[PDB]
């Protein structure tokens, strides 16, 4: 690790980290891009980025979204991509407090995670605290150091160093203080995470200039292009000496994604420093991603323009429209300007804090809450004793995301907490270590048996979601090998699909036809599956079970009651497997605005009932059996 | 020591090999071409592989290079050639040894020895077996032809200088129609086989075709497993066979 | 020449968005000595480098630039005025305009643009292949409907390539309406 | 009862704070209140189903449900009036 960094410093060229497998679709497509689509271009990507610094292909939301929404093992994604791309560094984003999870964890969870992530392919951990609190960053850092990998020490950017009237706190001198300090913690690389694209072009130039002067470490800049000024920023970062920048391919770039690497390439023509990559092969990468992107149309972001209101309210990433969606759910859609304004005000109400997952949800929650309850900076304190603050904000004022740069307003905290003690120390220090053995014990008892370390922390990190991934895997097996269109849509009559299981192992599946539903809402599918006819039964959810087809009553059979005429089931009256006498009402039909109550011929145990309330019926239909 | 097996073939025989293979706990590899894309045999092995989309129609169970590379891609110990494609092909089996793969059949020298119907006959004569008169070797021109024709006998049959499909032969009974024969069945032995090297021997009238089954191991032991009567032929082509003969 | 002809203003019209930042600097630079006309510069953000082209041109002394409101800007449109306004913070020259009013207009056009969704293009990403082929604003996608509209839309790779070549074949021309047709 | 989901809701007045409109198309799973009931801000009023996803519609403020436009299993388009409250 030490040596890599030394190497970087020597490089005249601007190096690049590709964010297409991670940050790009996290921003643009709700992190939905599947392993399948990554795997298919991994061999091309290895060629294109042969001289790339790293590929970011893990961390952020990918862990939880892979296991949960896509029903696939994020561990496989890493291990497969690792085998396919054996030559570029694999990088991930790791939040200091809880690595990749949703909660707080004892330190041994952080350690075990980094241990297994190192093992499976990850070479660079971008470590970031969501409040730039260095103390919370020490556990992850150590774990990366002991793993022999590269530990990237992250500062998140807010405010505006160009503007002295913006903050007295978020200054050039603050960021220099933090970097020098990260250096003494022995991180190999300084990263600047501009999560909201707030780093204006001059700012970047002044900021990187100073850090290059200030620390001997190489600097890795990361921004989003959501103001529409991303490329400009990188351009200035480049004149100031920046070592690495995070880019995406043209077609997975722009807006709230990374700045375009294809653009950046040509933008620099004629200037001192040169992006180090193959454009010829990035045009190619771009085209591939452009088509694949269409598979994902249902998850396209709402956003379609640059937005410079970012520089007032600072909502990172996507938030400036999830929150708008969220405001619409609460009757505030006509008053989104009042929310954008409360967003800013709540920031100052809170000491002026860095806003990324999960702090930005806090600020967002408060803002929604205050507009909803006609609340202001004074009355929040005045009426606070009888207010039910959002759980996210009480959590914040309890110390549970960490310590904010500036501390807590002591009165505000009082009012939010209503007595509850706050943490005097970073949240992970309070927690008992996880007994990992007890975890193996359990997982092995729940499953077949043989369970691995990746199974183990996966469960610890995400108990519910893991469990569920496993039920899904038991039910349908390895979903990740389906091609995305099939995974999202299934198949149309007449189609042949070709699923790749392994070198020389595929399933050729043709869908022939689907039957109308039987009396139970079951449709029979007729496939062919390599060479053999096959039939499958699937439950339909109708919208209205009038579609269902009932078998015909056997007429020469006294157990089968038939429909004597058309009509409708007005009321079901007896259930399957139940005693009735001769001449009992067991089903009320309606003919043509006429009641008649179909009654039992003898004393009986009801064998079957092929009908529910408000089902259509035609002459000669089996309604009931009786013994 | 056999762990993967590839069958360089299609259809019933391919499947048959796959059955024995599984029965011996050997993993199997199938090859298939464009229109075989549906052929059962392709779904009945553990791994299956398209044989050059670059290749054409039937000329693609015949592509030595493209098939060995497929074997190499799956680490195959051994190739079974079945019958009727590269099964009798000299080089194919050479490239197999040349690449660490065990051709499932006779030794290189054996395929060369019977790889041609003159050599076959010569090898036989040296093993001191009864054999059909005819000629010391092949026959170009037609001067070559008329010579032996006005010399020994007259029921005679000119025939292909190799291959186990009875398409390029033709029988000469009487003086003159000899003209055609040589050519008719020279470059119709063309379209059937590779070339059209042809000779002539006696034509034995009203024969029965009896063939003997042999198996040997790699340690000098050889048994026969009796005869089959393959006399019920349409072309010179087998239609019904009986074992053992009646 | 145009100065000689008595034009009041010199406009540089970059119809295909091919004016790369450094170029913009050196081209407007030279023109500012060469003639006394003010320079009015017009570009398309189709490569994604429009703002950068603008900033460089501004350093070089450009007088007027064509911009559009955020929500009607970018890709094959002009660069975002809202974006440039801030992009210039800390640099020598400032964009004369009202951001607050511009944010307000953006929002208006945001909703309005919604009325026209049947008319948006597929173009949703910057494209730096324009530097090889040089197709001005629309065309690239237009000339794609048309190529499928005749069953060649499986090798638009070659159309793009023929487009470039046709160009040199015709001795290398300026390509706007109607020369690009 | 010949059409059940083929009734036409009117459209919410977007500029009326007491009109709650549908935010996307889908399905009423469960009406949870009647014309006349009082409710608290954030109360469950309505469970809809979009594309196999359940969304719960809540009271915007405290007040009084004045009309309820839908029945279990009716279908709705963006913009349909679902509830009036005061
Ligand atoms: N000299 C011959 N006289 C009469 N009939 C012959 C002669 N040679 C071949 N035939 C006929 O052709 C048949 C087979 O010919 P041949 O021995 O060349 O086999 P092939 O064409 O190589 O294929 P296979 O022998 O495997 O069927 C014989 O069964 C016979 O009917
Ligand atoms: O629900 C109806 C069809 C079943 C689809 C199940 C898939 S598996 C991956 C995705 N995540 C889920 O929880 N369900 C869908
Ligand atoms: Cl610049
Ligand atoms: Mn990010
Ligand atoms: Mn124009």
Coordinates of C-alpha atoms in Angstrom, one line a residue, chain C residues 18-173:
Chain C
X18 CA -16.8 21.0 -31.6
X19 CA -15.1 24.1 -30.0
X20 CA -12.9 22.5 -27.4
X21 CA -12.1 24.7 -24.3
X22 CA -8.4 25.5 -25.2
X23 CA -9.5 26.1 -28.8
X24 CA -12.1 28.5 -27.5
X25 CA -9.4 30.4 -25.6
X26 CA -7.0 30.7 -28.5
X27 CA -9.7 31.4 -31.1
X28 CA -11.4 34.2 -29.2
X29 CA -8.0 35.5 -28.1
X30 CA -6.7 35.9 -31.7
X31 CA -10.0 37.3 -33.0
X32 CA -9.9 40.0 -30.3
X33 CA -6.7 41.4 -31.8
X34 CA -7.5 40.7 -35.4
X35 CA -10.8 42.8 -35.3
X36 CA -12.6 45.5 -33.4
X37 CA -16.0 43.9 -33.4
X38 CA -17.3 42.5 -30.2
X39 CA -17.5 38.7 -30.2
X40 CA -20.7 36.8 -29.7
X41 CA -20.1 33.1 -29.0
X42 CA -22.7 30.3 -29.5
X43 CA -22.2 26.6 -28.6
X44 CA -24.1 23.3 -27.9
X45 CA -23.3 21.2 -24.9
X46 CA -23.5 18.0 -26.9
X47 CA -20.0 16.8 -25.9
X48 CA -20.6 18.0 -22.4
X49 CA -17.8 20.6 -22.5
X50 CA -19.9 23.6 -23.3
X51 CA -19.5 25.3 -19.9
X52 CA -15.8 24.7 -20.1
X53 CA -15.7 26.2 -23.6
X54 CA -17.6 29.2 -22.2
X55 CA -15.3 29.7 -19.2
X56 CA -12.2 29.6 -21.5
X57 CA -13.7 32.0 -24.0
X58 CA -14.6 34.4 -21.2
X59 CA -11.0 34.3 -20.0
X60 CA -10.0 35.2 -23.6
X61 CA -12.2 38.3 -23.5
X62 CA -15.5 37.1 -25.1
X63 CA -18.2 39.7 -25.1
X64 CA -21.6 37.8 -25.3
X65 CA -22.5 34.2 -25.0
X66 CA -25.7 32.3 -25.7
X67 CA -27.0 30.4 -22.7
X68 CA -30.2 28.7 -21.7
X69 CA -32.2 28.3 -18.5
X70 CA -31.1 25.2 -16.5
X71 CA -34.2 23.1 -17.2
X72 CA -34.0 23.7 -20.9
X73 CA -30.2 23.4 -21.1
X74 CA -27.4 20.8 -21.7
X75 CA -26.7 18.0 -24.1
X76 CA -27.7 19.3 -27.4
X77 CA -29.0 22.6 -25.9
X78 CA -26.8 25.5 -24.9
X79 CA -25.0 25.4 -21.6
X80 CA -26.9 26.3 -18.4
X81 CA -26.8 30.0 -17.5
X82 CA -27.6 29.0 -13.9
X83 CA -24.5 26.8 -13.9
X84 CA -22.2 29.4 -15.5
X85 CA -23.2 32.0 -13.0
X86 CA -21.7 30.0 -10.2
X87 CA -19.1 28.3 -12.3
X88 CA -17.4 31.8 -12.5
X89 CA -17.2 32.5 -8.7
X90 CA -13.7 33.5 -7.8
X91 CA -12.7 34.2 -11.4
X92 CA -12.0 37.6 -12.9
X93 CA -15.3 38.1 -14.9
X94 CA -18.8 37.7 -13.7
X95 CA -21.9 36.8 -15.8
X96 CA -24.3 39.8 -15.8
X97 CA -27.7 38.4 -14.7
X98 CA -30.2 37.6 -11.9
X99 CA -29.7 34.0 -10.6
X100 CA -32.7 34.3 -8.4
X101 CA -34.9 35.1 -11.3
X102 CA -33.1 32.5 -13.3
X103 CA -33.9 29.8 -10.7
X104 CA -37.4 31.0 -10.9
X105 CA -37.6 30.6 -14.7
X106 CA -36.0 27.2 -14.5
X107 CA -38.7 25.9 -12.3
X108 CA -41.4 27.3 -14.6
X109 CA -39.8 25.7 -17.6
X110 CA -39.4 22.5 -15.7
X111 CA -43.1 21.9 -15.4
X112 CA -43.9 23.3 -18.8
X113 CA -41.3 21.1 -20.5
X114 CA -43.5 18.2 -19.2
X115 CA -46.2 19.2 -21.6
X116 CA -43.9 18.2 -24.5
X117 CA -42.7 14.7 -23.5
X118 CA -44.0 13.3 -26.8
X119 CA -41.4 15.5 -28.4
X120 CA -38.1 14.9 -26.2
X121 CA -35.1 13.2 -28.0
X122 CA -33.5 9.8 -26.9
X123 CA -30.2 11.8 -26.6
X124 CA -29.7 11.5 -22.8
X125 CA -25.9 11.6 -22.3
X126 CA -23.1 13.6 -23.6
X127 CA -21.4 12.2 -26.7
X128 CA -17.8 12.9 -27.6
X129 CA -17.9 11.0 -30.9
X130 CA -19.2 14.2 -32.5
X131 CA -15.4 15.0 -32.8
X132 CA -14.9 12.2 -35.2
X133 CA -18.1 12.6 -37.3
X134 CA -19.1 16.3 -36.8
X135 CA -22.9 16.0 -37.0
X136 CA -24.5 19.3 -35.9
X137 CA -27.2 19.6 -33.2
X138 CA -30.1 17.3 -34.0
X139 CA -28.9 15.0 -36.9
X140 CA -27.2 12.4 -34.8
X141 CA -30.5 10.9 -33.6
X142 CA -32.6 12.1 -36.6
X143 CA -30.0 10.3 -38.9
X144 CA -30.7 7.3 -36.7
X145 CA -34.5 7.0 -37.2
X146 CA -33.9 7.4 -40.9
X147 CA -31.3 4.5 -40.9
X148 CA -33.6 2.1 -39.2
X149 CA -36.4 3.5 -41.4
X150 CA -34.4 1.7 -44.2
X151 CA -33.0 -1.3 -42.4
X152 CA -29.5 -0.1 -41.9
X153 CA -30.0 0.7 -38.3
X154 CA -27.9 -2.4 -37.3
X155 CA -24.7 -0.9 -38.7
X156 CA -25.1 2.8 -37.9
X157 CA -21.4 2.2 -36.9
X158 CA -20.8 2.4 -40.7
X159 CA -23.2 5.3 -41.3
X160 CA -21.3 7.4 -38.8
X161 CA -18.1 6.2 -40.5
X162 CA -19.5 7.1 -44.0
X163 CA -20.7 10.4 -42.7
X164 CA -17.1 11.4 -41.8
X165 CA -15.8 10.0 -45.1
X166 CA -18.5 11.7 -47.3
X167 CA -17.3 14.9 -45.7
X168 CA -13.7 14.6 -46.9
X169 CA -15.0 13.3 -50.2
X170 CA -16.7 16.6 -50.6
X171 CA -13.5 18.3 -49.8
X172 CA -14.3 18.9 -46.1
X173 CA -17.1 21.3 -45.6

